[PDB]
Every structure is written in structure tokens, then in C-alpha cells.
Amino acid sequence: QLWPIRMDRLEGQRVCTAGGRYIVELDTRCRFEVAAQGNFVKRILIVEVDEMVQTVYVHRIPDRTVRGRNGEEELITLTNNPFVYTSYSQMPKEVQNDYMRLQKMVAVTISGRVAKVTFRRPSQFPDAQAQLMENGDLRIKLPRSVIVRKMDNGEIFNCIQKQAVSGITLTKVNEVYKYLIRFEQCLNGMDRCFPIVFSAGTNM
Amino acid sequence: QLWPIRMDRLEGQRVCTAGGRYIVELDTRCRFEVAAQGNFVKRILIVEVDEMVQTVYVHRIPDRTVRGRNGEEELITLTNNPFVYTSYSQMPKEVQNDYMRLQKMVAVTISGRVAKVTFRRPSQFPDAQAQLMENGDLRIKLPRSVIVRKMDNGEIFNCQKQAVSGITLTKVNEVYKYLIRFEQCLNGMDRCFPIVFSAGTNM
Ligand SMILES: [Mg+2]
Ligand SMILES: [Mg+2]
Ligand SMILES: [Mg+2]
């Protein structure tokens, strides 16, 4: 789902690219300080979620007023007259593009770095730990190598971009992936936890 | 539920009392070598479960031929003509009594010693580990003391015996709820235990 943006367990998280700065301020608020041509900030997107309703604040900054900032630097001061959007289609396409860049950075890149469930010594690999990331990706930490299963396209490759391999181990990744997805979706039936580290089976 | 007897994760568990020897041979088979007057074995119950069907074999051993054996000793050889029961009501009351003694020993005493879910550093006690036992009992291992919540009567006590409460009694029930909801939630697992875990934000 593209709306609202999911920021659960993603607080404190930042990313800096050539396109600007992406900051998840709270589990209910993230930010996109868009860097423009000439490295000045002309637009700041604020995305805030109250339970199930989401508000997107689009601040417009006059040119040559504020420069694109690096990661741990202070948040740029916001304007007092931002455009306000309460639903996706209300946003114009030119603003919608900047919104896509932010939610992608949060749901794909950032969520891919954050471990949600980690399983130590599965019966599938009693010699390592299997990590299911926030974006659904599976990461199996081996000595000096990582077996990666991408949630988006189902691809499988071993790493040090990297690649690749397959054969016998590729069959092995799917049950632990299924186990953990089964563990997560089942643990998604938890009452209104994550992140979790566990061991199961033997011995033990 | 008294039938069938639940023996999951209880293989290997044995108990020796004055009433006889109680042995869980497999997760689908348990055993009660009943001690008789004169410390001889006159009756052996075998309880076996195939998925959901349970068969109870009641062996009758002639008096004064075989003595009650101690723990980890060889299983007494069975007879070739045991009474066979496929349901609870089929059993006569004297066999039913011996059956109750076995299922109690397995579901209460033995199950109370086996940890099923253990949670390290819950937010309610980030300094200990909480264990949910097979019989539903909660055991919280503290430094030099154990907080016990009995599943049957809801009683709460520390550690001889001895009992406490007041402040701290409030702390035990949510973790119990947390773990029971964790257990019952993990009961929706596909066709795991036992499990040790840490959760949240101390890690
Ligand atoms: Mg370990
Ligand atoms: Mg620890
Ligand atoms: Mg501990």
C-alpha cells in the first residue's frame, strides 16, 4: 500500500542522497527535504499519520534561502503557509512524484535495513541467524557472506553489487522465509513485541 | 480435557512415587507401572495416541512376580493379553481411577516442570526471564527467588513454601497475558516449541 506511509519501528532513520534528505522523525512523521538544482532547498514534504488518516504538508521555500543539509544536521525550519493534502489524489502529479520518492525510500531502502524478526539457528541453518527485514526481505548472515531474498521480485542471491549462486541452498531459503513469514503473519495476530530475536526447537 | 492425554514435548519424562512409576515413553505414548500392596507390580497401563484417537492398554500382572522398579531402569515387559479401551467410558471405575492418576501426573506435575515459552527481559521485568510451562503455569526466575503463578487456581506466590504479593502481583498478570497471548497467538502456527525470545526495545 502506497497510502498512508508506514513508519512503524522506523523512528530516527535518515538517508542522504543527491536528491535531498530523507528523515523519519517519528513513527507517525517522516520528512523529505528535497534538494534542487543548485543544491538549495525549494521544497520540504512533511508526512504525518494520525491512526488511519494521513496529512501531507508541502512547504515551498524561496530559492537561495536554505542549502541542502547532511544527515545528522538540524531540521530545516518549516514555513507557515504549506499546501495541505488529506488524500493522495488531491496532490498534484508534480508533488506526487516527490511523495513517491519519500515513501519508496522509507518502505524499500530504509525498511530493508531494519531487522524485524531474527531467528537464531533454524533447523534450516543451525549455524547462523535468519533476519526478516521490515520490507519483507530475508537476510541470512553467514560467516563472511549474506544470503538475500528480495521481497519485491522474489530474487535470490548471495553477497560479498553482488551475486549470485543458487542450487541447493536456494531450496533451503524458502522454508525459513516461509517459517519467518509464517512467524510474522502469525505474530501479526498479536493483540494490540517487534522487533524480536528468538530460538526455537533444539536444543534449545 | 482428560482424553486423550497430552504428551507433546514430554518424551523422556519419568516420575517415581509410592503409587508406582510414571513414564512418558514418546510424545504419543506414556506408561503407568502401578505398585501394589506388597511393593509388587500388579497392573501396567499403556496409553497410546494416534493423532487424535487414543488406546489404553491395561495389563494385569500376577501378584508377587515383579517388583516396582526405580527410575531409568528397563521398562517392565508387557503381557500378551491386555484389556483394550478405545474410549474413556469403556473403562471400569477402578481402571478409570488409575487412568486419572496417570493423566494428572502428566498434565500437572510433569508438565509443570517443562518450560514451553521463555521470555527474557520483559518490559515488566527487564531484569529476569519469564517461563510459561506446559501446564500453563508461569515461572519467573529472579535472583534467589521464583515468582509462581499456578494455572489451575490462579494463586500467586514467591519461591519451604512461603508466599508474597501486594506490589509485584500486579506485574505478573500482564506478562502472563503477554505470554499466553504469545502462546495462543503462536498456536495459529502452521502444522517451534519450545521457544526462547527477547522482544521490543532493550536490545
Ligand atoms: Mg546463541
Ligand atoms: Mg541477553
Ligand atoms: Mg534473563
∠ Cα A188 A156 A1 (to 5°): 40
CB-based contact, B52 to chain A, within 8 Å: no
Q: Which residues from A are below 8 Å from B200, CB to CB?
A: 193-196
Type of residue found at A170: L
How many beta carbons lie within 10 A of that of residue A65, not counting itself? 11
Q: Determined by which method?
A: X-ray
> Which three three-digit cell numbers place residue B59?
495389563
Place of cell 495389563: B59
- Please tell me what DSSP assigns to residue B89: G
Task: Lay out the sheet containing B41-50: strands in order across.
Answer: B14-16, B20-26, B29-35, B41-50, B53-60, B83-85
Query: Cβ–Cβ of A197/B197 closer than 8 Å?
Result: yes
Q: Which residues from B are below 8 Å from A177, CB to CB?
A: none
- Supply the angle between the helices A168-187 and B169-186 in degrees, to the nearest 10: 130
Q: Are A87 and A1 in contact (CB under 8 A)?
A: no
Distance CA B193, CA B126 (A): 23
Shortest distance, CA B155 to any CA of chain A (angstroms) = 25
3 state SS of B78:
coil
CB-based contact, B197 to chain A, within 8 Å: yes
> Which three three-digit cell numbers place residue B73?
531402569
∠ Cα A124 A125 A130 (to 5°): 95
Strands B115-120 and B195-199, how do they pair? parallel
Q: Are A53 and A86 in contact (CB under 8 A)?
A: yes
Residue A198 belongs to what H/E stretch?
Answer: strand A196-200
Strands B14-16 and A196-200, how do they pair? unpaired
User: What are φ and ψ of residue B32, in 5° steps?
Assistant: -130, 100
Distance CA B94, CA B92 (A): 6
Q: Which residues from A are below 8 Å from B190, CB to CB?
A: 182, 186
Contacts within 8 Å (CB) and 24+ apart, B133-140:
B134/B8, B134/B9, B134/B10, B134/B110, B135/B107, B135/B108, B135/B111, B136/B180, B137/B112, B138/B172, B138/B175, B138/B176, B138/B179, B139/B115, B140/B172, B140/B175
∠ Cα B36 B38 B41 (to 5°): 40
Q: Are A159 and A146 in contact (CB under 8 A)?
A: yes
Strands B156-158 and A41-50, how do they pair? unpaired
Shortest distance, CA A196 to any CA of chain B (angstroms) = 4
- In order of A2, A89, A110, the CA distances from A30 in angstroms are 14, 20, 12
Place of cell 520540504: A44
Distance CA A173, CA A151 (A): 13
Distance A120 CA to ligand 1 centre (A): 7
User: What are φ and ψ of residue A44, in 5° steps?
Assistant: -125, 120
DSSP assignment of A73-129: SPPPPPPSS-EEESSGGGS-HHHHHHHHHHHHIIIIIIHHHSEEEEEES-TT-TTSE
Shortest distance, CA B64 to any CA of chain A (angstroms) = 42
What structural domains and CATH numbers belong to chain B?
Answer: 1-114 (3.30.1120.120), 115-203 (3.30.1120.130)
> Which three three-digit cell numbers place residue A15?
538517508
* Residue A17 half-sphere exposure toward CB, CA atoms < 13 A: 12
Q: Which residues from A are below 8 Å from B181, CB to CB?
A: 190-191
Distance CA B156, CA A100 (A): 54
Distance CA A56, CA A81 (A): 13
Distance CA A192, CA A200 (A): 24
Among the partner-chain residues A183, A187, A197, the one whose CB lies closest to the CB of B198 is: A197
Distance CA A107, CA A5 (A): 8
- Please tell me what DSSP assigns to residue B6: P
Q: Considering every ligand atom, which ligand is closest to the CA of B198? A: 2
Query: Cβ–Cβ of A196/B197 closer than 8 Å?
Result: yes
Q: Which residues from B are below 8 Å from A183, CB to CB?
A: 189
User: What are φ and ψ of residue B62, in 5° steps?
Assistant: -55, 145
Residues 130-189 of chain B whose Cβ lies under 8 A from any Cβ of chain A = 181-182, 185-186, 188-189
* Residue A193 half-sphere exposure toward CB, CA atoms < 13 A: 20
* Residue B100 half-sphere exposure toward CB, CA atoms < 13 A: 8
Distance CA A115, CA A117 (A): 6
User: What are φ and ψ of residue B95, in 5° steps?
Assistant: -80, -35
Shortest distance, CA B186 to any CA of chain A (angstroms) = 7
Indicate which of A185, A186, A192, A202 best probes the interface with B, i.e. most B CBs within 10 Å of its own CB. Answer: A186
How many beta carbons lie within 10 A of that of residue B174, not counting itself? 13
- In order of A4, A55, A87, A166, A199, the CA distances from A52 in angstroms are 8, 10, 11, 41, 34
